[PDB]
Amino acid sequence: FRLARENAPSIIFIDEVDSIATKRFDAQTGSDREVQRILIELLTQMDGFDQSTNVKVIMATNRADTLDPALLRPGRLDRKIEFPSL
Amino acid sequence: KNNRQLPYLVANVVEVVGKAAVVKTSSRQTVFLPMVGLVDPDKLKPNDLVGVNKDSYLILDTLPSEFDSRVKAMEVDEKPTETYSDVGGLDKQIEELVEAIVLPMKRAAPKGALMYGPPGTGKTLLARACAAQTNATFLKLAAPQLVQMYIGEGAKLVRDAFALAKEKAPTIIFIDELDAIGTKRFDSEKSGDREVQRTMLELLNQLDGFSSDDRVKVLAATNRVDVLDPALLRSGRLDRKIEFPLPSEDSRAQILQIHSRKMTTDDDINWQELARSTDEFNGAQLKAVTVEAGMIALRNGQSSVKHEDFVEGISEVQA
Amino acid sequence: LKQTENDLKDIEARIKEKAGVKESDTGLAHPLQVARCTKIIKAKYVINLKQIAKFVVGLGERVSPTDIEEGMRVGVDRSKYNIELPLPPRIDPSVTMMTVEEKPDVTYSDVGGCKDQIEKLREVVELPLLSPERFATLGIDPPKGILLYGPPGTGKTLCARAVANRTDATFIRVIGSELVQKYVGEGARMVRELFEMARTKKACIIFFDEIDAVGGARFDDGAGGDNEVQRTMLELITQLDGFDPRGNIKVMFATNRPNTLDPALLRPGRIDRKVEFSLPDLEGRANIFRIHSKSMSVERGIRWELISRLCPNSTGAELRSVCTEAGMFAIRARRKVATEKDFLKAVDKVISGYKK
Amino acid sequence: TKETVYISSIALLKMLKHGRAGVPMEVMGLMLGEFVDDYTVNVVDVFAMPQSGTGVSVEAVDDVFQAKMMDMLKQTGRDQMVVGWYHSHPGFGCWLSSVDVNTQKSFEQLNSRAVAVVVDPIQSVKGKVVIDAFRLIDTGALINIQALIHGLNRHYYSLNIDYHKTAKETKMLMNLHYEEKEESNLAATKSMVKIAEQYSKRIEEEKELTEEELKTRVGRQDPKKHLSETADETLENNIVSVLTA
Amino acid sequence: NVKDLKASQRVCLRSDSYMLHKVLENKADPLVSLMMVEKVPDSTYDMVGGLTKQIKEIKEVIELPVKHPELFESLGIAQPKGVILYGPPGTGKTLLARAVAHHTDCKFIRVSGAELVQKYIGEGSRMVRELFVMAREHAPSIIFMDEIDSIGSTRVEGSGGGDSEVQRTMLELLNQLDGFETSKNIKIIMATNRLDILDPALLRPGRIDRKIEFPPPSVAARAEILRIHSRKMNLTRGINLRKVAEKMNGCSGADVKGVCTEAGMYALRERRIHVTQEDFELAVGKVMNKNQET
Amino acid sequence: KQEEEKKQLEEIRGNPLSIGTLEEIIDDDHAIVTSPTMPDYYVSILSFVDKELLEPGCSVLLHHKTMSIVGVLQDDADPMVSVMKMDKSPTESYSDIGGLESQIQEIKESVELPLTPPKGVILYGAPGTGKTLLAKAVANQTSATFLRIVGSELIQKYLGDGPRLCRQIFKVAGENAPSIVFIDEIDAIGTKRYDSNSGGEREIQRTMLELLNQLDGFDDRGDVKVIMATNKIETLDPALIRPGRIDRKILFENPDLSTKKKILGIHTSKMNLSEDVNLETLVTTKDDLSGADIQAMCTEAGLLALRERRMQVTAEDFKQAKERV
Amino acid sequence: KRIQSVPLVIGQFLEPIDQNTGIVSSTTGMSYVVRILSTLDRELLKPSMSVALHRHSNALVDILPPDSDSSISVMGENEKPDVTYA
């Protein structure tokens, strides 16, 4: 992400971020503490970095549910584009 | 000069161009070398023991089958001499054994048969009987060893046992309660238990890996097997689903014979009465009756072991 | 006068052992679990029992004149490969923390209530420790090993100790937790020294408490460290099977659970008889009480029969919650001889306060 | 105590070559030279013991091959004193082996005195040299004295190395770098191929500096530093090409 | 010297000589795991402005405790060792926490609650103990419990029994911050619109000394919050923000940003770095959509 | 002088030498050692000081040579025992704790009474009023060596310390006799879990079991006694209980209004007040608080009267302070 | 110059103690007082960097322009993607 902002303008994209968007809702033991760091990371990184857009954080979503509005917090994930089809 | 140290760190080959080899140490260190002198391209191979000058990473020696893990946990009984008079009255599938093992072995075929039926009837014995009869390496490796916290480790264990017993092939591989690893479940959840599946899947592909080898007899004992696959009954895989139910009454008197056999006795004994009053013993319960009887013989004061001794071998609760 | 004296106590031994020191420090190198005699490439002559360069000397005649190699560690590690090789490098926990009591204080002690066991013990243990001959004359030997389960050791060990002492045989009690400890061949060697001292003590009871401690039949060997635990179990089983003379030496396993057994264990010719510790009963408690009482100053006008009347059947150990609880009632009632209600209240109290 | 070691750089490099490739092993073998009066450790030569699959040892020394050579060397006219011991000690300042000592110590017997030459062939390659020679004991000293008579002499205890060759090979050395004319002017008159770069290189200099100068408005990167060192590197290299034209 | 030496002390050891080459600065690095410490964060409280009444209350439950602890020690009390905010959510309450925690010059720490006690024995509670450690190192450091507080920006809505044991061990630390600590202007911010799911032992002072509730808010708060957020963005004169905030209903100070973003969304879609008034009131309803939507 | 006499003893060593752990002291006056860097060598002391001064598996003076034992090295890293509160005739007496007498007699009859029987007690209930205060009460009332240890303090993940730690405690218990054995907060070394294998800590049980091995290794006529303080009842061995040895589970409960009033009358008067403040005034408004919120009502009352800017606290402040804390 | 040379090792620059000094990391995790570029200065010096170290001289030879691909498990990299829209 910094390397991208080292590469700024760069791109940030994610394949089904809803995979990491799932985090521990309880003590979830194995495999779920990364996304704790990693989801909240971007949450901390979205919510914790300025708006000068050389880089957009993009995320593939067929499923936006395991996401959190912490992502959806405006100024951060503003744009929601829906693949129709249809 | 060169030779040797006790021992070297061994390493596993990758390339064998034609003169080229890289290995990675028992210290976990990848080194190329022109394939060294003391070693042979066939001896040369991944998963290998090698005398290797550690400093030079020059493979000094090949190292053979050796203090290499047999997985001390794993338990080998080599071709134990056993007959089919171990547990009597089972001569029924003792034929099926011969039909699935001896006859396939001694002529040119399955790589083994599927047992089922309660042991203590000496399923193992009939295996070990076949292990003497065919004179094939008996391997009883506990599925307790095969169920693993490590990914495909029982597979590795089955892999070692595969080779290690095939080292000693002709072999009868005797699986203890196949239903332990006899579970692939039904679905995509295999993360949780890959092992019981994948370890099973390991042997299957090792079974799917030969047919005409009758040296290898993979003999899977259960009280009854759980899943059934045309794999699980297959020529080249477990071919023959083979029962060992608790044998019939004087099939057990035949066992009770083998049990009432070696007791010094007064001949009060009547097996069939015992054998009918006892019911459906896996053999040793007759012997439970019997050893009680012998015990009860001294508990009856007799060195001779009598029907009463045995009916008191019955009397100590046989359920 | 006092200047230098500490020096040659050491500097000598220092410089002296500084040979042995530098006789370790060659190739960058009792009680061996691991000899580290390292990367001697000509030669390395080492058992490394270790995750760094685990090593073994044998397979072909391999020794070294005094010393295989170095480490200060010279030897076979603990897990042994060939022999000796350079005299013992080995063990590891002191000798044995297991219990060996010949002629235990229990002849009849918690023997109250347990007789079935005790009777089952008798032909398994008593009559053979009396006369293995009759069993040879039966054609068998006694049941070569005997599982005991239910409440352990309360009377269970004592009941074993009984027939041990009832026959005055040596009673070897062994704790499976002692068997499963922090190094390799932990129980093995002990199980060895057991089997060593077994036929030394023969006409004796080898008794295993906590065979659930060593684990029984389990898939837990899949973890990879429990193999040793199993290997110890393997060791024992492997060992115990053949060479324990079980006409004289008695093989007995105390446990909570009879089912947990490694299938090898209950096999005929290994464990023939399989017994539950018979729970101390209305009578057993009384006498088990009565003995618990004798340490205390207790009323003898009252009966431990009387107390055990009130009590349901509980472990021969807990029967002090009956008795020794009234050492206070002795001084609570200030009856140096604690009275009926003293222990009745104890039976009240401990069971009242029990609620578990 | 201040003792004069003298090496044939031949033998030096010979060892190096042998030692450079010798990694892992400490290279082993003779050390050919003498002692001129005291202090004087001469080296004409040296050589590999052949590989020791037993590694460096007092044992792995074979005096067969030396003689073989030494004969052929005597045949060569090649003859010296074996003056000590030189090995390749990867990442070793330290000391070689008390063995190596004992090894030598067994051997310096054969002389008035010897060496065990420390080499880290690793640390040798650095473009500077890494090396030492121990012989741990003295007569008295430069005459050190006490610990011997007090016994228990152990230490690193280097000797003081030197070496000499000649202006002769020096030429033949500096001959390193028909010839020049073919080798020089004209042989690297290739420039113009890069004029673009040669420009662009020079071109790029410019920017770096407006930058640099600017900061004038602390410590280095300084506004008036890299400026010259930058616009001065493309000045010359750009003038030498003129010689061709 | 020997005496100047201290435990943990960073030094130059003579490397190969394994004697001290010299002494260095004994020192270390920060921590993570969802309890991570954030070092004197930066925000100012006038941006949720119009809420400064509570902020002035926050100033009296934090800043004036933090700025001058002794005015309350001249008062003689134990000034707030922890702080609460209560009432309408969504203003960017984190700012209310931070802007003061910023103004106070205090490390504002963020600790996800449910992980402070866990299934792994010692794993969860280790966070608790270490949390007590690296917080006070940089004291004054104003702690905040993540995944607890119902202010609504930080809201997980705490938890009843999951955070309770966490609380019980933190309330342990919060009676421990009431122990030999007496750590004040070391404040876990427990700022919650919900006090039931958490033990009443927390509101027991020394954990939260000065119990203060942050309302309202309303048009006015937002209008200001609006006038704050719309202030940043270039606008079109003639704009009446009160009307816009009069349009605003069920909206909050962070949702106020939505309006300015949507009015900006409008105006940037209007090809305007300026923004008219209409966009905002249009943005109101459009944010009043999402305020009412989902 | 003695400087050099000693210094030569240092001059022996050489230096800097290696702090390193023992493994097995051996009578050869060698011993096998333990290195964090894991050279582990069977090696000798430099003998003036004593092997006996140290234990197998302890950090000892070692050269850089073979790690030859140089002599006695602390390994001051811990105290003389594991983690302990070592007290004798401790501060807390049954009087200082407010009325706990319900279970004071439990700790009295078990420990105090026999000292002229069971070997000790199990504390349960709440700390800071019942358990900790009771802990020292009869310990003071028997006036013996009170050893306070928390299972979290002892929560040893190293295999064998937890026992050795407890043994280090039992080391004191035997020598420092009469020794009150107190055991605090066992949630960790005392939960026997389900198994001896596969991720369950033996050092849990192994600590406890040996602690229990040493626990079950003593019972008395009232001299030396044991205390078990924790909230987890069934994670523990019944042999750890061993009914007949510890039959006392002392489970504290919120001090009843009078026992409260004693902790009140104690802790009300010990925070300044206005005679407006009264016990039954403070008794009644309570829900049956712990002995702490007794105090805590009284404590804050100062602060709330300090919030009134008065050292003599009103009746409301307490009523506020309690209904606060 | 030739003091510098290639066969170096990797670490992570931690922190300067002062100019041409600092604590860094090793890919062996070694962190020690070492030297750095006298080449760089201050603004030239970079406060955390993958770094270049001599083995024995063991000092900072140079920073490493930022490393990327560790685990994690990397990132999407399509440099000039092949897809035109429509």
Asked if the Cβ–Cβ distance from C124 to B71 is below 8 Å, we say no
Burial class (CB in 10 A: 0-12, 13-18, 19+), E132: buried
Structure tokens at F143: 């006036």
Taken in order C308, C314, C315, C321, is the CA torsion positive or negative? negative
User: Resolution, rounded to a tenth of an Å?
Assistant: 4.8
Distance of CA F150 to the CA centre of its chain: 5
Q: What letter does residue F53 receive in the DSSP assignment? A: G
Please provide residue C125's backbone torsions phi and psi, each rounded to the nearest 5 degrees: -130, -60
Return d(Cα D201, Cα D218) in angstroms, integer: 29
Find the helix or strand (DSSP H, E) in which A86 lies.
Answer: none
Q: How far is C86 from F252, CA to CA, in rounded Å?
A: 62
Burial E231-258 (b: 16+ CB within 10 A, else e): eebebbeebebeebbebbeebbbbbbbb
Tokens of residue D88, six digits: 């390749």
Q: What is the dihedral of CA C58, C62, C64, C68, to 10 degrees?
A: -10
DSSP state of F88: E
Token reading at E163: 């955070």
- Residue F310: exposure state from Cβ atoms within 10 A (0-12, 13-18, ≥19): middle
> Which three-class secondary structure state does DSSP give residue F38?
coil
- A78-83's contacts with Cβ under 8 Å and 24+ in sequence apart are A78/E261
**All residues at 6 or more sequence positions from B229 whose CB lies less than 8 Å from its CB, including other chains:** none
Per the CB < 8 Å rule, is C325 touching F243?
Answer: yes
Alpha-carbon separation of residue G52 from C184, D124, E80 (angstroms): 44, 20, 50
Q: What angle do CA C124, C129, C133 make, to 5 degrees?
A: 90
**Record: contact C223-F221, CB cut-off 8 A:** no
> Tokens 């003298």 identify what position?
D6
* F298: enclosing H helix or E strand: helix F291-307
Question: Between the CA atoms of D37, D41, D45 and D51, what dihedral angle is there, to the nearest 10 degrees?
Answer: 130
Amino acid at A8: A
Is the backbone of residue F56 left (phi > 0), alpha (psi -120 to 50) or beta? beta
Which of G56, G57, G58, G61 is the best residue to mutate to test the D interface, defined by the most D CB atoms within 10 Å of its own CB?
A: G56
DSSP state of E233: S
- One-letter identity of residue D180: E
F18: left (phi over 0), alpha (psi -120 to 50) or beta: beta
Ligand-binding annotation for C156, yes or no, is yes
Tell whether C157 is in a known binding site.
yes
Method used to determine the 3D structure: cryo-EM
DSSP summary character for residue E152: S
Whether B48 contacts B10, CB under 8 Å: yes
Residue D152: CB atoms within 10 Å = 8
Q: Is F117 on the interface with C (CB under 8 A)?
A: yes
Give the CA-trace dihedral at G30, G31, G33, G39, to 10 degrees. 90
Peptide bond into C123 cis (omega under 30): no
Structure tokens at A22: 């799932």
**Mutation site, G64, G75, G80, interface A, largest A CB count within 10 A:** G75
Is residue B243 helix, strand or coil? strand
The secondary structure of residue C223, as a DSSP letter, is: G
Pair of tokens at residue C316:
């021969």
State the DSSP string of E90-107. Answer: -S-HHHHHHHHHHHTT--
Helix, coil or strand: residue E255: helix
Distances (CA, A) of C278 to C106, C157, C162: 16, 11, 14
The DSSP element (H or E) to which C50 belongs, if any, is none
What residue type is C200 in one-letter code? T
Segment (H or E) for D208: helix D195-214
Q: Please say whether the dihedral angle defined by the alpha carbons of residues B265, B268, B273 and B277, taken in this order, is positive or negative.
A: negative
Residue C8 CA from chain centroid, whole number:
45
* Inter-chain CB proximity G32 and E15 less than 8 Å: yes
SS3 (DSSP) at C111 = coil
**Interface touch G41/D126, C-beta < 8 Å:** no
Task: With an 8 Å CB cutoff and a minimum of 3 pairs, decide whether chains A and E touch.
Answer: yes
Q: For the CA atoms of chain A, what is the radius of gyration?
A: 14
Pick the residue from chain E with its C-alpha nearest to F153. E122
Q: Tokens for D20? A: 């450079």
- Cα separation, B316 vs C116, in Å, equals 11
| Gap between the Cα atoms of E186 and E167, Å rounded | 17
Copy the structure tokens of residue G47.
């406060």
* Chains with 3 or more CB pairs under 8 A to chain D: B, C, G
Mutate to test the interface with G, among D221, D226, D230, D233 (most CBs of G within 10 A): D221
> Cα–chain-centroid distance for residue E11?
38
In Å, what is the CA distance from A49 to each residue of A1, A18, A40, C81? 11, 21, 13, 63
Token pair 């640099």 is found at D212
CB contact under 8 A, G68 and A6: no
State how far the Cα of F227 lies from the Cα of F110, in Å rounded to an integer: 10
Please indicate if any CB of chain B lies within 8 Å of the CB of D51. yes
CA–CA gap between residue C18 and residue E68 (Å, rounded): 66
- Cα–Cα dist G13/G15, whole Å: 6
Amino acid at residue number C232: T
The full DSSP string for F231-277 is S-STTS-HHHHTTTTS-EEEE--SPPHHHHHHHHHHHHHTS---TT-
Nearest to E34 by CA among E167, E144, E164: E144
Residue B159: C-alpha distances to residues B73, B175, B206, B293 (Å): 14, 14, 8, 45
Contact indicator for C175, C209 with CB cutoff of 8 Å:
yes
In whole angstroms, give the CA distance from residue F45 to residue C14.
8
Q: What residue segments make up the domains of chain D, in order of their start? A: 2-163, 178-245
Rounded Cα distance between G31 and E16, Å, is 15
Element (H, E) at C224: none
The arrangement of strands across the sheet holding D81-82 comes to D4-5, D40-46, D31-34, D81-82
Is E160 annotated as ligand-binding?
A: no
Write the residues followed by a gap in chain D (C–N more than 2.5 A).
143, 177, 217
What token pair was written down for D123?
């640390």
**CA proximity to C28, closest of D55, F313, D143:** D55
Which DSSP letter does residue C298 get?
B
CA pair distance B227, B233, nearest whole angstrom: 11
Element of type H or E holding E137:
helix E123-137
Cis ω before E216 (30° cut-off from 0):
yes
Query: For F25, which DSSP code?
Result: E
Q: Is B28 on the interface with D (CB under 8 A)?
A: no
Cis ω for the linkage preceding B170 (within 30 of 0): yes
The closest of B72, F198, B146 to C234, measured between CA atoms, is B72
**Inter-chain CB pairs, B–C, below 8 Å:** 127
What is d(CA E100, CA E67) in angstroms, rounded to the nearest whole number?
11
Q: Which two tokens stand for residue A63?
A: 């499923």
The interface residues of chain F toward chain C in range 157-216, judged by CB-CB distance below 8 A, are: 159-160, 195-199, 202, 205-206, 209
Is C42 in Cβ contact with D98 (below 8 Å)?
no
Q: Residue G60: which residues within 8 A CB-CB, separation 6 or more?
A: G13, G22, G24, G34, G35, G36, G37, G51, G52, G53
Q: What tokens does F222 get?
A: 């009232």
Contact E163, E198 (CB under 8 A): yes
Q: Which residue has the tokens 């008593």?
A: C126
Q: How far is CA F169 from the centre of its chain?
A: 9
- CA C145 to chain CA centroid, Å, is 15
Which residues precede gaps in chain F, with C-N > 2.5 A? 116
User: Which amino acid belongs to residue G85?
Assistant: Y
Could you give the CA distance from residue B159 to residue B71 in angstroms, rounded to a whole number? 11
* Nearby residues of C8 by Cβ (< 8 Å), 6 or more positions away: none
User: Is the four-CA dihedral C188, C193, C196, C202 of positive or negative sign?
Assistant: negative
Helix (H) or strand (E) holding C99: strand C99-102
Within a 10 A sphere around the Cβ of B233, how many other Cβ atoms?
A: 16
Could you count the other beta carbons within 10 Å of the beta carbon of residue D44? 18
Q: b vs e for F249-264, b when ≥16 Cβ sit within 10 Å of the residue's Cβ?
A: bbbbbbbebebbbbbb
Say if residues B100 and B223 touch (Cβ distance below 8 Å).
Answer: no
CA E122 to chain centre: 27
Question: Please, what is the angle between helix C186-200 and helix C226-243, to 10°?
Answer: 20
- Measured on CA atoms in the order D67, D71, D72, D77, is the torsion positive or negative? positive
Instruction: Round to whole Å and give the CA distance between D159 and D136.
Output: 9
Distances (CA, A) of C354 to A15, C84, C173: 59, 56, 30
Nearest alpha-carbon partner for F209 in C94, G61, C178: C178
Please choose, from the candidates C159, C151, C155, the residue with its C-alpha nearest in 3D space to the C-alpha of residue C120. Answer: C159
D119 φ, ψ to 5°? Answer: -140, 125
Whether residues D54 and C42 touch (CB distance < 8 A) is answered with yes
